[PDB]
Amino acid sequence: VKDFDISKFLGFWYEIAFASKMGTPGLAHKEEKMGAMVVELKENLLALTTTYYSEDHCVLEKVTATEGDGPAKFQVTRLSGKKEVVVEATDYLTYAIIDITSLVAGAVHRTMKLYSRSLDDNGEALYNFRKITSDHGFSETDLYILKHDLTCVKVLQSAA
Amino acid sequence: AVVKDFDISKFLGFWYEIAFASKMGTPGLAHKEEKMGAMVVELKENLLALTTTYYSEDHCVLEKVTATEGDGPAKFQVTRLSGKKEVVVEATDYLTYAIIDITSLVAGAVHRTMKLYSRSLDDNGEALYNFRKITSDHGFSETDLYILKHDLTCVKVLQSAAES
Ligand SMILES: CC1=C(/C=C/C(C)=C/C=C/C(C)=C/C(=O)O)C(C)(C)CCC1
Ligand SMILES: CC1=C(/C=C/C(C)=C/C=C/C(C)=C/C(=O)O)C(C)(C)CCC1
């Protein structure tokens, strides 16, 4: 996305689907639980709190992202384990498809996800996710549509 | 029928179950573990012999069953000791997929289930898109759709029982 403006993406986002190779497984173992994300802007850094299911438990991760050479490219430096997240597509109103490249201590991981402001009528967004991820080298076998168990969402709604 | 220039000749053989809708229931789907479902369609004479596999938690079940035509082209009737089923073909491109509507009678649940069959395991994009639109205007929420997990353990048992 060239013309990007983060004021528009602040807040609570529901993780609808992900694609991973890768697955182982993671997420879930058984049963899958849905994930979610909170985007805040904290002192010119993007402060982020995600939740997701991981072998028997709902993980909560709080992270910081610094903007990386314009537009919709962000970078998360973990203990010298980088992640690179790019906004691939967005209609600026209901959904955003994200591309994550992470280096988890040697291991490279290439993830794509579909976030949505809503748990309902995500069909157009889902169809675009399937076109874009096949374009990025993922097959149908690599896409996971999250089951609508909300336990983790609810945990994140409450606080952190 | 709902599609009206249907010929079963076009639909014989192997099909994967890609998604279903049930209300819501739871868981449903399946339970745990989702295991991919599938079907073999055989034309005996005056009868459609169908053999299905699905995960009934402890194992993959192969179930063989018969269907007869029930006036109007795309409509079939299958009777089981559990109840009768009216299945109708709602949509098809005649080449890669079919969306089926099942009105069931299993001892009292006047329920419907819609299922998406496909010829293939990839490039189901447009079929899935359609399926979401049709299930939507038939009373189903996104919550009621079940996109099947690509675990193929039952499927390979179906393929192989039919293969050899
Ligand atoms: C969801 C989302 C966004 C994501 C931002 C970041 C920073 C995502 C990081 C993801 C990681 C780091 C995932 C992982 O490791 O699984 C932005 C604000 C672009 C647009 C609105 C929706
Ligand atoms: C899949 C499929 C077809 C299905 C036929 C029948 C007879 C389905 C019965 C389903 C039941 C009886 C399901 C259940 O109870 O879950 C036909 C040949 C129309 C078109 C090609 C794909």
UniProtKB/Swiss-Prot annotation, chain A:
Post-translational modification: There are two similar, immunologically cross-reacting forms of this protein, designated B and C, which probably result from different processing of the amino end.
Organism: Rattus norvegicus
Disulfide bridge map: C58-C152
Organism lineage string: Eukaryota, Metazoa, Chordata, Craniata, Vertebrata
Name of the molecule in the record: Epididymal-specific lipocalin-5
GO CC term, one of those recorded: extracellular region
Superkingdom to which the source organism belongs: Eukaryota
Compartments, record wording: Secreted
Protein function: Associates with spermatozoa in the epididymal fluid but does not bind tightly to them. Binds both all-trans and 9-cis retinoic acid. May act as a retinoid carrier protein which is required for epididymal function and/or sperm maturation.
GO molecular function: small molecule binding
Tissue-by-tissue expression: Synthesized exclusively in the proximal part (caput epididymidis) of the epididymis. It makes up a substantial part of the total protein in the epididymal luminal fluid and binds to the sperm membrane.
Stored InterPro entries: Calycin, Lipocalin, Lipocalin_CS, Lipocln_cytosolic_FA-bd_dom
Pfam families for this protein: Lipocalin (PF00061)
Alphabetic keyword roster: Disulfide bond, Secreted, Signal, Transport
Protein family according to the UniProt entry: Belongs to the calycin superfamily. Lipocalin family.
